[PDB]
UniProtKB/Swiss-Prot annotation:
This is TIR domain-containing adapter molecule 1. Phosphorylated by TBK1. The phosphorylated pLxIS motif constitutes an IRF3-binding motif, leading to recruitment of the transcription factor IRF3 to induce type-I interferons and other cytokines. Polyubiquitinated with 'Lys-6'- and 'Lys-33'-linked chains in a TRIM8-dependent manner; ubiquitination disrupts the interaction with TBK1 and subsequent interferon production. It comes from the Eukaryota. The record marks 149 as: (Microbial infection) Cleavage by CV3B. The pLxIS motif constitutes an IRF3-binding motif: following phosphorylation by TBK1, the phosphorylated pLxIS motif of TICAM1 recruits IRF3. IRF3 is then phosphorylated and activated by TBK1 to induce type-I interferons and other cytokines. Homodimer. Found in a multi-helicase-TICAM1 complex at least composed of DHX36, DDX1, DDX21 and TICAM1; this complex exists in resting cells with or without poly(I:C) RNA ligand stimulation. Interacts (via TIR domain) with DDX21 (via C-terminus). Interacts (via TIR domain) with DHX36 (via C-terminus). Interacts with AZI2 and IRF7. Interacts with TICAM2 in TLR4 recruitment. Interaction with PIAS4 inhibits the TICAM1-induced NF-kappa-B, IRF and IFNB1 activation. Interacts with IKBKB and IKBKE. Interaction with SARM1 blocks TICAM1-dependent transcription factor activation. Interacts with TRAF3. (Microbial infection) Interacts with hepatitis C virus (HCV) NS3/4A protease; this interaction leads to TICAM1 cleavage, thereby disrupting TLR3 signaling and preventing the establishment of an antiviral state. Ubiquitously expressed but with higher levels in liver. It comes from Homo sapiens (Human). Changing residue 112 to T: No effect on IFNB induction. A motif (TRAF6-binding) lies at residues 85-92. It is linked to Encephalopathy, acute, infection-induced, 6, herpes-specific: A rare complication of human herpesvirus 1 (HHV-1) infection, occurring in only a small minority of HHV-1 infected individuals. It is characterized by hemorrhagic necrosis of parts of the temporal and frontal lobes. Onset is over several days and involves fever, headache, seizures, stupor, and often coma, frequently with a fatal outcome. It is found in: Cytoplasmic vesicle, Autophagosome; Cytoplasm, Cytosol; Mitochondrion. Residues 2-154 are annotated as: TRIF-NTD.
Length: 157
């Protein structure tokens, strides 16, 4: 039931190879230095490696996201890892897709429109399961893009 979908996990990957060969080297080299709390870059790092054909790193980078489960899944998803992990989607299945695009909107690779639609799918998944990071996402996807995805009337203290 695909009511309506925007971005995607691999979607960000298509935008990668749709950037430019060198564009990969650049970003990559730019990813070389991940940020404290970044789960969209480090991930893109592995997603950029492929663009080159050297996942040997993507595996490392991904493994450098013990926190992010979307990275450990992106290792066997793209890197083609030996699914060393288990057959189970992460909690940031889309969140990571929202955080990944959050950086893509910085390189003029994709419009925030995606970073949003993405956050939603993550705002609904966490809200649907009332995760412990739900509200955190409602404040994250906001502090990032800067909207009221949470679904607030805007006038909230």
């Amino acid at each position: 039931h695909m009511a309506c979908t925007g971005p995607s996990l691999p979607s960000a990957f298509d935008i990668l190879g749709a950037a430019g060969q060198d564009k990969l080297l650049y970003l990559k080299h730019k990813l070389k230095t991940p940020r404290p709390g970044c789960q969209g870059q480090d991930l893109l790092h592995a997603m950029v490696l492929l663009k080159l054909g050297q996942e040997t790193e993507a595996r490392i980078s991904l493994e450098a996201l013990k926190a992010d489960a979307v990275a450990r899944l992106v290792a066997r998803q793209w890197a083609g890892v030996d699914s060393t992990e288990d057959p189970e989607e992460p909690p940031d299945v889309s969140w990571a897709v929202a955080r990944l695009y959050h950086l893509l909107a910085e390189e003029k690779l994709c419009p925030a429109s995606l970073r949003d639609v993405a956050y939603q799918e993550a705002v609904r998944t966490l809200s649907s399961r009332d995760d412990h990071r739900l509200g955190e996402l409602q404040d994250e996807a906001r502090n990032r893009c800067g909207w009221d995805i949470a679904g607030d009337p805007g006038s909230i203290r």
